[PDB]
Amino acid sequence: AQSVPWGISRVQAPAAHNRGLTGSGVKVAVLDTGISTHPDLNIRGGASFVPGEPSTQDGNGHGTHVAGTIAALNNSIGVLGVAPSAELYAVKVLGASGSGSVSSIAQGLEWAGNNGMHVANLSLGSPSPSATLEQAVNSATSRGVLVVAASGNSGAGSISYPARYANAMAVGATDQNNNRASFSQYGAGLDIVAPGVNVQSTYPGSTYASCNGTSMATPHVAGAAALVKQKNPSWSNVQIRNHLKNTATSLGSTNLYGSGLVNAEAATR
Ligand SMILES: *Cc1ccc(-c2ccc(C)cn2)nc1
Ligand SMILES: [Ca+2]
Ligand SMILES: [Cl-]
Fold first, then answer.
1. Number of H helices and number of E strands within the chain?
2. CB-defined site of ligand 1, < 6 Å
3. Atom 7 in ligand 1: which residue has the minimum CA distance?
4. What is the position in ligand 1's atom list of the atom closest to the CA of 205?
5. What's the number of domains the chain is made of?
6. CATH classification of the domain holding 189
7. CA atoms of 158 and 115, how far apart (whole Å)
8. What residue numbers bound the domain in which 7 lies?
9. What is the dihedral of CA 61, 65, 70, 74, to 10 degrees?
10. Residues linked to residue 29 through DSSP beta bridges, in sequence order
11. Measured distance CA(93)–CA(57) in Å, rounded
């Protein structure tokens, strides 16, 4: 039996699916700890930039979980992603510990731009800026990648890098009441929010687990971007980003929520 995690319903992905929009034909890179083989995922390819971890399999769990929020398969098992037909790529930039370097993340972004990705999900960040990272965000953006990044989990009224950069779409986390999760960073540069509390997704060992974080919010938006791209194949990264913001549901101040809650139904109407 398949179940639909509450956040998938909250962002109204099923309404898009009913219109025939699944993310088919859209390439989404998950720049994370890898993605493990799983019966509810279809991993099309990828690359590793973590020395000593040449495989793109996930030794942590984080990247597998993120991937399932984007693209868990629509079938009779497991869960269901926002964009269940997205072409999913495992871009390992963080090791099994859950950390990497700005160099590995940059290499993943360059890979995305050189390999035709439409969306890059970066459920990662730091409080400090990085020239290396910024350059790679900008390069990927120039190559047509929509970079979607987590605002961070410190609870502060400023957001992490690379989410803070103008060419990243920064995503904060909401709870089931449509309030900002306590940990969700906010402030200047925040673009949008999505569900990030008690988010069930795919997990290594062919299982499912629930997690909290802006890392869980981010893939809802990456998936919504893929739905928008399938509907509007001619659109650029900027056009998709703007449309997601313009069609989001206001939840309160732009400072706490950016444009508000992503709405895949409104974005694909
Ligand atoms: C052994 C093991 C199994 C599951 C997990 C886990 C589940 C959920 C989240 C959010 C993080 N980690 N860790 C270790
Ligand atoms: Ca499924
Ligand atoms: Cl490996």
1. 9, 9
2. 61, 209, 211
3. 209
4. 3
5. 1
6. 3.40.50.200
7. 32
8. 1-269
9. 110
10. 89, 120
11. 12
